[PDB]
Design a protein around this ligand. Structure first.
Ligand SMILES: Nc1ncnc2c1ncn2[C@@H]1O[C@H](COP(=O)(O)OC(=O)[C@@H](N)Cc2c[nH]c3ccccc23)[C@@H](O)[C@H]1O
Ligand SMILES: CC(=O)NCc1cccc(Oc2ccc(-n3c(=O)n(C4CCNCC4)c4ncnc(N)c43)cc2)c1
Ligand SMILES: O=c1[nH]c2cc(Cl)ccc2o1
Lengths: 333, 323
């Protein structure tokens, strides 16, 4: 059997080129090399208050984006988190092997709490435990995520090691798979800020489903720097905007940063932005063409969700049974 | 509609005569008045690190003893919490509608289950459209949270949950044998304060013999909680067993010493416990009967719980599972 890949994305907000390069691109590339399981984590999404119709639509939007990106339901397991009860079940059990301080120190909880001071809910606090459950249910070896999820992933390793030390080889210790390019795509007008899929200022984001012409305009208005002469060179500390543009270009084209730097020798931000805009616009055009073919086919989305939950349930139920046996529950009849 | 009562039976800790005569005995006789649900809450148990085999055993011990006390799995619903996934599912969902501040108002080294179990308890109750909860006195804030969560969710989404109420009325006072001012508690570390339902007649005699009394001269068997708490407790225990009134026992023990009272208390308590214990050991050692009870109970519970969860999931907006 192949090693197992698991990762998830929230059906909230609108997935961005940041979500793509930090995660979905790796997801697509790993489907033959590993046994891949990809999840739409609707239970995580509701740690930020969602409109019920937006949440249902976004769940189906996200599924269609997975397919449009090239996640292949004949190769990977694709499912909606709430369709598999074992996620919540293991999540509760793992609460008892997670310490309050491990959770209160999470950067995501802190940032999200500051953004939503009116809804600092227990789900938002407990977010990393459910996420560890998501991973550990599937005997997961590799978790492809962006840099922002590294702290959460490290906790899932701590939890898996803690549990295994008490009970045996119940879980695999997962390892992060974080790309070299695009692991932390930054905001176009505030390049010291991670690009958010829920930004109040849409001019910060490149949405995967956004009108490509709208995206090209945002790219040309992305902030750069005052360097005289303007020079296309990677330097996050001094040239955050130009660096972020180079990172996006490198991630779409596959070209290395040194190659791009050489390509733009003697050139300035107009050439840089012109070809970030060209590359991204073409990617989004092709992606969106596949997207609508999947999104408007309810029968196909319904079948993918059904088969995926069935495949996921078979894995998850096996792990949960071993967890429940280890901690001392009377096994269900 | 016949009200739904939800009770969470914690597996660890053997029930005492205070648990039986003070509450369960009466609930056993209300199984036709209410749709009673008895959930053996193993998922609550694991907030405290404990031996796995002992937790499995205590789950089965608790099930057989509830059956032995007369819970009728045909009239009531009795099941193990972990056998019904909806409890954890609704628990997660209700985390997202519970303020962090609410849990902190109930450090870095406590586990998250210890912090988060009040939400699980709210899910346990709210799954079954529960009308009544016989909470402990230490669980009243927890029930208030469950009511707050239910109303908050209902205000956003419609009348999805019943708002549960405490079961207000109390049925017998059983105090600690060596500290007559303290209720006899199944979680007491001093086992000599308690009489467990499984104790043998020699154990009962010994514990009653050491039960504190007073230095009244002459000794006088008369009820007076303020001045004769130990003797009063022995009288309450004896009346709760035999049904004889406190005045009748006072007349019966006129001119008698505390040794006589204690002798009668032990005999009466052990007589009560013998039919309980016979039923217990017979149920506890019938693995297939226990398995059938848990299978049937989890099936009944899950049928009800899944109805509520699906309404919750529909209201939140989750895409419905494809079966
Ligand atoms: N600007 C950015 N640049 C690069 N990568 C980025 C950027 N913003 C986000 N990401 C990555 O996108 C993925 C999905 O993010 P979500 O917020 O939906 O989703 C999250 O942040 C997860 N907690 C969802 C989840 C739930 N359970 C899991 C188990 C395994 C892996 C992931 C999950 C993530 O990999 C995230 O790192
Ligand atoms: C007696 C009764 O029927 N109560 C209603 C009810 C409803 C639903 C679940 C339910 O089960 C539980 C089980 C345990 C708890 N619980 C619980 O009540 N406490 C107490 C212990 C001391 N007094 C204050 C807090 C818990 N401490 C740790 N972990 C827990 N899980 C704790 C809380 C609830 C009980
Ligand atoms: O990760 C988690 N936390 C949880 C809390 C409750 Cl109450 C239920 C399931 C959970 O899964």
């Amino acid at each position: 059997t192949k090693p197992i890949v698991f990762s998830g994305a929230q059906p909230s907000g609108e997935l961005t080129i940041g979500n793509y390069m930090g995660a979905l691109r790796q997801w697509v590339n790993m489907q033959d090399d590993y046994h891949c399981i990809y999840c739409i984590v609707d239970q995580h999404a509701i740690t930020v208050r969602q409109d019920a119709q937006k949440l249902r639509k976004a769940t189906l939007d996200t599924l269609a984006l997975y397919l449009a990106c090239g996640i292949d339901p004949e190769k990977s397991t694709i499912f909606v988190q709430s369709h598999v009860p074992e996620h919540a079940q293991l999540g509760w059990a793992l609460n008892c092997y997670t310490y309050f301080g491990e959770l209160s120190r999470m950067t995501q909880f802190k940032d999200k709490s500051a953004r939503y001071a009116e809804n600092i809910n227990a789900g938002l606090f407990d977010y990393p435990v459910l996420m560890a459950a998501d991973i550990l249910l599937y005997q997961t070896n590799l978790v492809p995520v962006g840099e922002d999820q590294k702290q959460h992933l490290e906790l899932s390793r701590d939890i898996a090691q803690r549990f295994n030390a008490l009970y045996g080889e119940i879980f695999k210790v997962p390892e992060p798979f974080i790309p070299k390019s695009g692991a932390r795509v930054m905001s176009l007008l505030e390049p010291t800020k991670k690009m958010s899929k829920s930004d109040d200022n849409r001019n910060n984001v490149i949405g995967l489903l956004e009108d490509p012409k709208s995206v090209v305009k945002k790219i040309k208005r992305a902030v750069t720097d005052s360097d005289e002469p303007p020079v296309v060179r990677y330097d996050v500390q001094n040239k955050a905007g130009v660096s972020n543009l180079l990172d996006i270009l490198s991630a779409v084209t596959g070209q290395s940063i040194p190659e791009l730097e050489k390509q733009f020798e003697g050139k300035m931000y107009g050439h840089l932005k012109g070809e970030v805009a060209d590359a991204v616009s073409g990617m989004l055009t092709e992606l969106q063409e596949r997207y609508h073919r999947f999104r408007n086919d309810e029968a196909f989305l319904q079948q993918v969700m059904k088969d995926g939950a069935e495949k996921a349930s078979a894995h998850a139920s096996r792990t949960l049974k071993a967890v429940y046996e280890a901690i001392g529950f009377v096994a269900k009849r």
